[PDB]
Amino acid sequence: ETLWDKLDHYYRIVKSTLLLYQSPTTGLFPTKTCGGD
Amino acid sequence: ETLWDKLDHYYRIVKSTLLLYQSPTTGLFPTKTCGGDQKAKIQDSLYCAAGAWALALAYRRIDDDKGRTHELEHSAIKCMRGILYCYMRQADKVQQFKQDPRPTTCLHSVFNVHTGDELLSYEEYGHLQINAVSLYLLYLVEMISSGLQIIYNTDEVSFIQNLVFCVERVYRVPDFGVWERGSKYNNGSTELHSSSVGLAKAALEAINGFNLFGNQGCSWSVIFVDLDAHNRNRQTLCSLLPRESRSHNTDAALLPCISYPAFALDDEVLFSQTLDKVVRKLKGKYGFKRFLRDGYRTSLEDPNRCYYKPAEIKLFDGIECEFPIFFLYMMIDGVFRGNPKQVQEYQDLLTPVLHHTTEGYPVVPKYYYVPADFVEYEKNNPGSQKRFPSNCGRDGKLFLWGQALYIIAKLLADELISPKDIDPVQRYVPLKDQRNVSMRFSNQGPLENDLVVHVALIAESQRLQVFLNTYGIQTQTPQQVEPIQIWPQQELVKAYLQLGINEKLGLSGRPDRPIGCLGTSKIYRILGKTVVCYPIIFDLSDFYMSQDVFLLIDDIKNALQFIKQYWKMHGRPLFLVLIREDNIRGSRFNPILDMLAALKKGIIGGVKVHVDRLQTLISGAVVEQLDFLRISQPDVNISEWKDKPTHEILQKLNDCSCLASQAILLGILLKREGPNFITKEGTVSDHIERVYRRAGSQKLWLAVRYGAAFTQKFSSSIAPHITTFLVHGKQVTLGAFGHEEEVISNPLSPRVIQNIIYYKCNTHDEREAVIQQELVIHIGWIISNNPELFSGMLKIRIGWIIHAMEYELQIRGGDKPALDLYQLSPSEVKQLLLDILQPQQNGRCWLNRRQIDGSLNRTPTGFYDRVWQILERTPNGIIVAGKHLPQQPTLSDMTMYEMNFSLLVEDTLGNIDQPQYRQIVVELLMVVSIVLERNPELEFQDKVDLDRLVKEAFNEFQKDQSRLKEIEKQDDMTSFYNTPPLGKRGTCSYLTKAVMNLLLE
Amino acid sequence: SNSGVRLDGYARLVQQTILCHQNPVTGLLPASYDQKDAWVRDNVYSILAVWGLGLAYRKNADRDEDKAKAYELEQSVVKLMRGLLHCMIRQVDKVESFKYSQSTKDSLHAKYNTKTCATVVGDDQWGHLQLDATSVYLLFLAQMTASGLHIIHSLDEVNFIQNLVFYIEAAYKTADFGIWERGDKTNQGISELNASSVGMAKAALEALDELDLFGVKGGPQSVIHVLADEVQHCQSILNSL
């Protein structure tokens, strides 16, 4: 397995956990992932 | 004890040893510390200056140094200034060497110390040495990067630029070597040395893109470098790295080039292999010897013969001197590599051999010698006896270079400094930092190659652009890129030529030389205008193979591969391609679509490419800046028409339309009247050029070749091919089959080679010049891309290969008359050459295969060593074709792997007229070698007559054929040639029978 | 040199005329006079001067000071365009509502506010229908993206731009108040078609055919896809009138 597979997996986990909840208006993440805080 | 005591002790050592004998007038140390010698080298003074600089750098770490550092910096600066003044004193020699390098025009390396003037004539020392200049440049740039100041004004910058220009071409001219002797025979010959090439490459890397003024500098302290010279130096180093020279298997001089002074071998495994080989083959009890069979100032040496007589080297072995200075270099390598055990072992080894002064100061003697009463006893038992110290080991004589190396090694071992301080430029890096360096390794890592190259598409005419667009091809006309300008290669060459001109001394600048693809791959800015150029493959060429699209496909693919393999600059390279309307020419318009569609796809034979608008690629990219400019069948036969009058020939030329008759009439007119004659279409030369261009446009190959022979035009790439053939180990001979031939063993200037080949062409034939040029370019390209194909051949002869493919084409024709090779297309010629170059298989007649093999002068692997072992076990010798090879001189002069023994064997074997006979003789010799090696009980009683053995084998084959097939006695041995060497009844069986018959009697 | 003196004089004039009221943080200049509002049209048109000054200054800079000045000008125009995009992206509900059916109530406001980028008026006190401003903004944004000035950062802005493309794609059958914000010839404005808006929208639609917003380092999904039928319809309407 080349570096492409690991980097792709890191991309998927980052998209699914970190960048999913980014606010487009301000670019600041919230303190809660549920409830619409 | 604090650091003060140690630094004071080192100060006393330096004052009593190194700086005591400095010359105030010039600041350069001499070679002899007694007798008032007036001779000086360059290496010792530079090494002493480097040691003083290192000591001052160590002493800098104290704020109360009391001016100790100032004296050492000033002494180093004075030494550098004196050496620079001595170098710049001789100005005519530099200009002469820049044009026609030779020992006559070489820069002097030895001169008087009192006034800095020459003392001894160049006929007794050679004075050809380039390692000193490279090492001086490296040390100077290191000191400037450290923070010292040595350059005063702008003339020194011009002198440094000219020195770089002169040293750029060191990869061809042989040198005299580090030891000044060169060849082991010591007869007066110059050879290539790998250490000099490595030092030159290291200096070329170091000097690239550096400010010479130090802290401040805007545009008058930079140095420009060419990537092609660096690439060629790297190729030469890599090719000649396993063996230091053809005549030297190994030498101790390979150490300061793969160590701290150079640090140029970035290969790990090969560097380790070379280090192990040198250690195993040159280790000694009292130090490291220079090399094997070195009679340098030994007991048997006498001061009455500068050049050693033949066979004296055999007597000179076993008494080689010992130089303990290499122990310091090994210790420095050990501490640099972080291996304390090696440092401890070498310190313990060096402890007893070290001597002491009256005050106990350490002494490093130069060499070790054996007394005359143990000349023979030492030979039986190597190293069991004891040697005696030299004169410079007790009192009154010292070795400044050795003492400087000793103090540097001791300072490094005592941890008083760090490796970073002594190497401000970071010459040596470890394996984990080789990731984003400049000029050495790529950003992808060392063991990775996935570079992506940008490609720009530019059209030529609006009609061609719209024609391409109708098929979906996107190209842009040159008129729509108005902000961007496209210039040919000659403009950049002229701009480079304008650089480096000085009026006070007289400077010609950079010589007018073509620029490689890597140089043209960049983007320049001239007078505030961006300048882009395309490779020289696209420009119009008078030659004929540029009209074959297959050759263009192959050469653009080869250029792409070259760019992919040898690109290390930051940023993606830029590639420009132009398409001309005359290229398609109707039916020849499809494969161009194929290549361009493959290019648009993205991958070209495993090479990734990118295509986009040129303006988009230009924006956001680094652009090189050149700021210097602002500051500054025929119906006419030769015999029939030879005696015709001039007016009749003129009328025939006027009223004839055939191209061949026109060309032959123009040639007759040129031979009889001259090039200055006036005809109906202007001058003779203009008419010849016009008819040559018309033939090229019509692409009829015979007339184009005839016109090219008339115009006396030659390609500008023969010199790289001959030099890489020479560095590979092969030989090339220029001539015609069945006629005189000229052999080349050393690189030569283009003028001499051109004159020789043109005189030969005038002697024998008419079009062999262009055929030879096409053959040599094709062979060079093939060996560059497929080196394994030419394995087994040593002497490359173009005429014999020409006869070879002519014979093969005649055989292929069969009943149909053989096609003339002058009318063959370049693609067909390349296909024929590749077909004959193939390792060959069965099916065809074995006689033809033997003829082809003999014509190519192919030799089996291991033939040379087998011949050498036969000669060792042949008390009398071997006689062939009337030539004699006495055993005593070849055994007492040459060695197992020396190339000159192989050259003598090839010269002896080259007297065979029939190539098939030569192949049969070689096979018989191999059979004899194998049979004799497999059994040591049987030995030859006298010299063997291989002609007699061949005749006996032929007679036995004749008897066998008469017995089996009832064939009478037939003359000639072509029947033997037809029979394969292996099978039911092969040639090997008859050779073995002859061998056993000879052995039994 | 004379060119340097002329460039310095033009830069001084631009600084004294335009750059005095750039209003940082928000990046929107006041629409002249003491009205305290930011009209989109004038604010977009007030940028070509500084953009051309920066473009001319970049090519002849060759020095630290001039390169720094060009850097400042390009970053200033980038700031202003980001300020423009923020106000429009704060009103996604309005464009989403306008995407289905055509009405004056579900249209973006034509006069945005100063700092905090809020609303100043309701939906029944001004004519909030100006396709020309959005068309010219998109066209100029495509132009400066082509020159090489980064304006887009997040991928969601690509989706917003794609939605706005459909928002302005129906300009050939949609009536607007007009550039002068006075409806038809007389007062008591009634929505009526004008050729200026269609001509404004046609070139804006043509510009974003394939131009990626991520520059030379984009990806498979980095370009805006547009149709061709609307361009032909707009051209025919313009030719007829």
PDB file of C-alpha atoms in Angstrom, chain B residues 3 20 126 147 165 227 238 242 247 261 295 361 380 413 566 576 586 616 625 862 875 900 928 931:
ATOM      1  CA  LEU B   3      40.063  25.697  27.935  1.00  0.00           C
ATOM      2  CA  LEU B  20      57.159  30.120  12.045  1.00  0.00           C
ATOM      3  CA  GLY B 126      54.070  19.543 -16.636  1.00  0.00           C
ATOM      4  CA  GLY B 147      32.132  35.621   7.288  1.00  0.00           C
ATOM      5  CA  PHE B 165      34.513  29.053 -17.435  1.00  0.00           C
ATOM      6  CA  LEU B 227      23.718  22.740 -15.912  1.00  0.00           C
ATOM      7  CA  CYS B 238      29.603   7.836 -12.200  1.00  0.00           C
ATOM      8  CA  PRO B 242      34.603   2.085  -9.600  1.00  0.00           C
ATOM      9  CA  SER B 247      45.941   1.969 -15.489  1.00  0.00           C
ATOM     10  CA  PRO B 261      37.429  17.828   1.802  1.00  0.00           C
ATOM     11  CA  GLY B 295      58.509   2.800  -6.475  1.00  0.00           C
ATOM     12  CA  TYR B 361      55.962  18.345  20.336  1.00  0.00           C
ATOM     13  CA  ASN B 380      59.172 -13.351   1.467  1.00  0.00           C
ATOM     14  CA  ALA B 413      38.415  14.659  18.392  1.00  0.00           C
ATOM     15  CA  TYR B 566      18.025  14.829 -14.865  1.00  0.00           C
ATOM     16  CA  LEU B 576       7.742  24.219 -25.832  1.00  0.00           C
ATOM     17  CA  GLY B 586      -0.711  15.201 -46.934  1.00  0.00           C
ATOM     18  CA  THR B 616      -1.300  30.569 -17.247  1.00  0.00           C
ATOM     19  CA  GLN B 625      17.038  37.292 -14.331  1.00  0.00           C
ATOM     20  CA  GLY B 862      35.829 -13.489 -19.863  1.00  0.00           C
ATOM     21  CA  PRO B 875      55.964 -21.378 -20.848  1.00  0.00           C
ATOM     22  CA  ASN B 900      47.047  -2.455 -22.102  1.00  0.00           C
ATOM     23  CA  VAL B 928      41.548 -24.670 -25.046  1.00  0.00           C
ATOM     24  CA  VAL B 931      39.966 -27.821 -21.233  1.00  0.00           C
TER      25      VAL B 931
END
